[PDB]
Amino acid sequence: NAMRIILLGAPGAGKGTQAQFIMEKFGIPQISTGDMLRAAIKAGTELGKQAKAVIDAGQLVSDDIILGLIKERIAQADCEKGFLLDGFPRTIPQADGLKEMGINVDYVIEFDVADDVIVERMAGRRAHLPSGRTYHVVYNPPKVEGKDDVTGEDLVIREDDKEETVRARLNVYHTQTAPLIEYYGKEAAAGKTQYLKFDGTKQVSEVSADIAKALA
Amino acid sequence: AMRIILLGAPGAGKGTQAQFIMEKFGIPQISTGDMLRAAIKAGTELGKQAKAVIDAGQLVSDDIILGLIKERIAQADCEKGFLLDGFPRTIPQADGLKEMGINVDYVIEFDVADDVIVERMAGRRAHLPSGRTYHVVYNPPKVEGKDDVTGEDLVIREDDKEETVRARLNVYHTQTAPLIEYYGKEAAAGKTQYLKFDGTKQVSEVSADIAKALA
Numbered sequence A: 001n002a003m004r005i006i007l008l009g010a011p012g013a014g015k016g017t018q019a020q021f022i023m024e025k026f027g028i029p030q031i032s033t034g035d036m037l038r039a040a041i042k043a044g045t046e047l048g049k050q051a052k053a054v055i056d057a058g059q060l061v062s063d064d065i066i067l068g069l070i071k072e073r074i075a076q077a078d079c080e081k082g083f084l085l086d087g088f089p090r091t092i093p094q095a096d097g098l099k100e101m102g103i104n105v106d107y108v109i110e111f112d113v114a115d116d117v118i119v120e121r122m123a124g125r126r127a128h129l130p131s132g133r134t135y136h137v138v139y140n141p142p143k144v145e146g147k148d149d150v151t152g153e154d155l156v157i158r159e160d161d162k163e164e165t166v167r168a169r170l171n172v173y174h175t176q177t178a179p180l181i182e183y184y185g186k187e188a189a190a191g192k193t194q195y196l197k198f199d200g201t202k203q204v205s206e207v208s209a210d211i212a213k214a215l216a
Numbered sequence B: 001a002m003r004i005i006l007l008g009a010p011g012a013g014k015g016t017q018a019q020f021i022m023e024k025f026g027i028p029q030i031s032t033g034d035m036l037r038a039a040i041k042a043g044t045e046l047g048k049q050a051k052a053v054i055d056a057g058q059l060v061s062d063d064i065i066l067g068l069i070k071e072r073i074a075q076a077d078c079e080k081g082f083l084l085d086g087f088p089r090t091i092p093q094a095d096g097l098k099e100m101g102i103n104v105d106y107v108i109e110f111d112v113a114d115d116v117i118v119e120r121m122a123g124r125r126a127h128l129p130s131g132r133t134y135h136v137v138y139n140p141p142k143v144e145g146k147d148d149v150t151g152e153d154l155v156i157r158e159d160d161k162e163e164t165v166r167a168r169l170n171v172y173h174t175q176t177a178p179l180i181e182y183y184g185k186e187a188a189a190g191k192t193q194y195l196k197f198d199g200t201k202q203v204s205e206v207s208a209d210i211a212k213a214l215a
Helices: A016-027 A032-042 A046-056 A065-075 A094-097 A115-124 A163-189 A205-216 B014-025 B030-042 B044-057 B062-073 B093-101 B114-123 B161-190 B203-213
Strands: A003-009 A028-033 A082-086 A107-112 A126-127 A133-136 A194-199 B003-008 B029-031 B083-085 B104-111 B124-129 B132-136 B193-200
Touching: A003 A016, A003 A163, A016 A028, A016 A082, A016 B030, A016 B062, A028 A032, A032 A065, A032 B029, A032 B030, A046 A065, A046 A094, A065 A094, A065 A133, A094 B003, A094 B014, A107 A163, A107 A205, A115 A163, A115 B003, A126 B093, A126 B161, A163 A194, A194 A205, A205 B193, B003 B014, B014 B029, B014 B083, B014 B104, B029 B030, B029 B062, B030 B044, B093 B161, B104 B161, B161 B193, B193 B203
Parallel strands: A003 A082, A003 A107, A028 A082, A107 A194, B003 B083, B003 B104, B029 B083, B104 B193
Antiparallel strands: A126 A133, B124 B132
16 A cells, blocks of 8 residues: 655644654655755756756746655655655645645644644753754753853854744744645545644654554 | 865855856755755665664764765766765765765865855844845845845844854864865875865856866
8 A cells, every 4th residue: 555644733843753753654755845845956956956046036936846846756766655745735726736746645644732832842942053053951951051062152042942933933834724724624524635633742652652543 | 077075164155156066067966964864854774774863862973974975976866976065074084985985076165254254144134933034235125124025024143143153164164174184185196186266256257267177
């Protein structure tokens, strides 16, 4: 058989831990829309070119450009058993595009972790600006609070990590995602796809469990 | 066949000529980070291996990076050559390559004075939540200090201010200096062609000379 999944979840919710689990468990690669495209431009593929031409000129990348990569990405040999789409489609026409290019998804999984949780998580992040080395006050502390483990120089909390900024970020995702939730929730209700929501504050081992249970 | 190493300060926009060369000469730009991030997401045996290091809070080791590049450059698109951007960063990494028989035809040192980089950086403006990136001299918003889309405020990223930039740059050269002598020594022997270009100059003008050189 084959296995294709779309994956949604909030910026900072840390969904990648389960992408990489799905990866291992089902053996299907990760395709970041942003990485796949970054790769192409730097590799100078036909599509990396075309994109890179649009970019240079400061213009908006056509969707026809994007589905092609994905048509080429899933045309990679590593996708034989399927794949995982991370935070894509981002729009209804992208939902439609996938379909109209022969990509019809088995499961749509949504990793939700309350906004409020995520902000406190971002808030723990520190960094050292001259070297860009990062820290988190819980998940991986410096050996000393406030100080860079390599230069002994003080740490900062990035601005983009702060509530104001993360909160702004969060509202856009929600604002953008809701119709896809709505779109595929509509697909799923009509058995077109299976839509699944997981509590991402349960321990990884736990979430990983339920996830496997569903995908039987 | 022509193999190439790009050396250049962060933000001096070496990436800019790295794309010229690829366009002009048809060889891919190879970024270790990117190459590394992609193996992880593809979950290659090595990508898998490397991912484990990260979750352990450790650095990825040379053998793994070297094994990824080995993997990269054996790919179809590299038959006529490739551009290494962001590697090697150590002498052992440098020796690592040579062992594997990496036949660098040119080492290219992209140079912009510190003070020029500072002023370059001094012009970047960010809209924090999207990470979109304006620039007052090279790429301004529709509206001054305002985000075209949202109409939000653009900030002067703390990351782009002088104390840090020169801090960063300072570190940059201490690290890089030994590669320069390393490749200076190699060139001395003849094992590669060492080149150097002033990046303070305009791009199409810089790209021009590069092409002449690699003719």
